[model samples]
Target chain A: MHGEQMAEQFPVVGLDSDAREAVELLASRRLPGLIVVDEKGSPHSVLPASQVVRFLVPSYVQDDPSLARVIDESLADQVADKLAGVTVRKLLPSQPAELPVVKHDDTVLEVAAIMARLRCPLVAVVKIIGAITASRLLELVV
Target chain B: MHGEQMAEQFPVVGLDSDAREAVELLASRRLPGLIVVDEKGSPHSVLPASQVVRFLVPSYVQDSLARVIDESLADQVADKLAGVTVRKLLPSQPAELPVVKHDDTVLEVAAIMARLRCPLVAVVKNKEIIGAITASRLLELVVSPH
Candidate 1:
């Protein structure tokens, strides 16, 4: 079946969501990135999961770090791995964007171009100024 | 000269890693996916950002507990706006893979493919396998075939 069956739904977290809550959501839900939305449910930013990992690892540490007493190279490597464990915080984006809304009347070729340019598999559908799923951009190619 | 200077080093995550940690890492880095690795650093599952998004919003949900308050309503409304913040990871699977060792000159052909419309591989020199260069990587191929 195609996107015609039924569209799926997910939550768009608000900017005020705490890092701890975002972590719980990601860990429990296994979400890739979350949409950061305003109070009115409008999106602001998309927080990808990789950014969370980077937040855990400081650029300074990644670039340069102090050696412990022993300074064993092997041990230093292990410490880096350990650091990854403690400093990381799971959080949501303050504002995540929704899909770019498109109309069903749009040409399939137009949809394909947008997907390729965006490097995304799907786009949002909209009618009467509300979000909707018209069709996945992938539908045309497949 | 190009993404050469700007391209960030993609990290390799273990396939068995905590799905939560993986998700956090992806969000923090704005990355498309993690190169799922074995203990030996060999490739396994290429978990894309798309998979994470799919997981966040499962097909089923408790109606009253949902943000939209109505499961059916959310089903209709959410799809129109789900992909904005999402990034996907796509790859070509070959029964047999190719290798260029840890360090080698990046090849023109590989670079060419990296810039193809459908996506392709990249070549590295002494560095861990980096992210694939996509059609967007091409200077001339961005708008048309080379």
Candidate 2:
């Protein structure tokens, strides 16, 4: 019954920041999802690095043969270079729905229902004192 | 007591195969993860799509990409994947693959998933995988109509 105690600090993202910059924090840290805050610092959306990759790799819908140019390294440079200066707002899916959030007093059952509804792995436990990731939620049940 | 009920039949990936094929399935299906199995169809690793991305995009060089990824970028991605075998991704550079017995309780599966920070769990029986239980699946099972 206490998400306040359950919540833990995590890397958070904001709309104006660069998309790839945010990706680095989530990908490197391997958080369940990046907790996003809006201009007002309120919970905007919760995003995971899994879905994050999809946003960056647009070619999923459908490729070059420079024949070879140190491919992986070159692609890394190309991929990283592409996201430079792009805002996190653009990285988000072009849709809106219930924000993945839970109040400090919300119970585990309550948290479980919302997370299931959203089909996301993390949820803001505040308006962002911290976030309750899927693992964290399951921890209590176990 | 039935992960089988909670488990769903997902695209099973094999180690003797190419990961690029797995990547494409993940990319196309948007599934949480690919349940990686051995040549005998036994449980091996519960490979998440995120983990695939981690290997695809070199972890150390995440300094930047927001521009529109086009055909060339796709080509580069595939080219990189062309050589990465599923075997390489696991025993070498893979994420910790979490698996549990098929009859394990929901709580039991949740325990491993929580501890591992893995979104997917493999349900195995006698060394053979029966199915998988994802975080989404577990969440649904936990949250009743209430």
Candidate 3:
């Protein structure tokens, strides 16, 4: 199946949305990630669910998990507070790899190569329209 | 550097560890996931950070970002997660984990992660877990071109 046909229109988050909201969508939807859109409602970037965790925890704490036990529960409660005013763009990697996108008519092999070469969980499958995980691509291609 | 040279000695958690601990470790360690080890201390499966959020939020509230930030909702997520063990959260039939040998090229590691849809790949040497490679690390190799 082609991208436009098989491509699912997932809930795309706005660039201005709070990181917390993105986390909620990812968690609740059990989605690998969300399609982040620009001001024009066009897909801008891919926010994989895993990247959201970086916004929730501090760099130092993120480097050492055992340190979590050292912090009091009161402080732990404030974890989400860190993301209160943070925008999705702020959390995105400063220099992300070339944005991975594909056309609706692109072959499944083409889509699979884009994902593998870029090492992203998902891609922004474009059209003029309209993206997989690796195993998902293999299922389609192979 | 190859997977072995670049591999980091990450901390490992047991299946019996509280799910909360895994959360803290994942958050604090800044790792893509935790190495869930067997009694022999070998890797059994991974608990990626992506999966951690699933346990933190309820299915009903997933689509609404506004409700996700409610203090009560966050607390409720934590409360529900407290008693659960890592073993319980795992799939009954564990999927084959993606892995790369220490000597494998960065390209090889990337291929494994892409095929498996895994954020982290275990670096093994004769079945022993030596270290891991994360997607971010792989991206460094891709964009930076060193």
Candidate 4:
């Protein structure tokens, strides 16, 4: 099957949308990730779930896992607090790896290859149609 | 490899360890999750990345993304995580975390990950953690099956 036929409809937030909302969708739906759209509903970037976790963590802690022991466990809530006032676009890495994209006519194997090569959980379409996740594609093929 | 041989060395934290430490390990290692050990070094539970995200979010806001109308409110849920113990945030059903033996086949590892929807599988031998098999490793095995 082609991408469009298999591409599932997913929730999209604007670049300026609250990233916490994106986290909620990912958790609620048990999704691998979500799509960010521009003002005109154009695909901007793919927000992998890993990035969301990264945003919740402090930079210092990210560099040194051991440093986590020194911090006051009482203030752990601050991690989520830090996500406040942040936009989905800001959460993305400055130089994001190339996103896996396939035309609507691409075959299942073609999409799978791209996903594996990119090491991304999901793939976006050439246009802003929707997205296909590893699980979705597996359901199609298997 | 046998499950033990293929199991990789990853960050190990106590149930009482700082949650942030787990977050840091999760970020740096970029593994699916980490192995949580008890005081005596026995496997207590598996802390998947998704569980961390779930802990930071409140139940009310979980279902409705629109409920998070205020951008600042998004991070409010995560504040509690700073001071909490990993044990507190442990999944209610710890049994669901995939666990395999050192002798399990690569296909067995793959099946556990797929069937249980786990990011990685814990390798245990005689109740001791020897290593782990992650999604990336499974992918490599699939692409280059000999």
Q: Which stretches of candidate 4 lie over 4 Å from their true place?
A: A67-69, A74-76, B1-146
Q: C-alpha displacement of A115 in model 3, angstroms? A: 2.4
**Model 3: how far residue B72 lies from native, Å:** 52
Task: For candidate 3, give the lDDT.
Answer: 0.58
lDDT of candidate 2 over B1-146, digit per residue (tens): 46667677778988888977776676566555677778878767766554554454433233312122222223356677777877765536455566776776554554455444455677767776777766545543433233
- Ten residues in sequence with the least summed lDDT for candidate 3 chain A: A133-142
Query: Ten-residue segment with the worst summed lDDT in candidate 3 chain B?
Result: B61-70
All candidates' TM-scores?
Answer: 0.36, 0.48, 0.48, 0.48
lDDT of 3 by residue, B1-146 (tens): 67887577877888887876676666565554578887777778876554544444344434323223434432454676778988875656664556677887554554455444455677888888888766545533433322
- Per-residue accuracy of model 3 over A1-142 as CA lDDT, tens digit each: 5666646556777789887677666656555566788788776877764455444445444443334343433223444566678887876766533346777775544454455444454666675244434334433322
Ranking by lDDT: 4, 2, 3, 1
Please write out the lDDT profile of model 2 over residues A27-96, one tens digit for every residue: 4554445667789998887655444544443241112112122123233344466677788887676663
Question: Which DockQ values do the candidates obtain, in the order shown?
Answer: 0.02, 0.02, 0.03, 0.03
Pitting candidate 3 against candidate 4, the one with the higher lDDT is: 4
User: What lDDT score is found at residue B122 in candidate 2?
Assistant: 71
User: Model 4: per-residue lDDT, tens digit, B57-140?
Assistant: 445444323223453322443466668788876867764446787787554554455444345667888888877666444433
For model 4, what is the error of residue B42's alpha carbon versus the real structure, in angstroms, after optimal superposition?
13
Q: What tens-digit string does per-residue lDDT give for candidate 1 at B1-146?
A: 23343233556676445554565566566455555655655555455554444444334331113333333322332343344221222234412222223332223322223222122233344445554432223212211222
Q: List the residue pairs that clash in candidate 2.
A: A80-B64, A82-B65, A82-B66, A82-B67, A83-B65, A83-B66
Candidate order, TM-score descending? 2, 3, 4, 1
